[PDB]
Amino acid sequence: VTLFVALYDYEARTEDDLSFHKGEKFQILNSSEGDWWEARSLTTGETGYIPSNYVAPV
């Protein structure tokens, strides 16, 4: 079990990062690389890389 929510919003300025607002659920699949992990949008379904400091455990 590893569900993290976005504590803040973010506008993906690239085709790699993602876009969402506080309250959006995210599935952190890999969080070992730099400070950016790859989460999967449970709503849209597209995966991307978001700031790890912008998400926290349920």
Binding site: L7, Y8, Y10, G34, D35, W36, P51, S52, N53, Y54
Partner: peptide, 14 residues
């Protein structure tokens, strides 16, 4: 390079 990391909204401002 060093991940940018959008600094949260200042020190919890507003």
């Amino acid at each position: 390079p060093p991940r940018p990391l959008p600094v949260a909204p200042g020190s919890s401002k507003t």
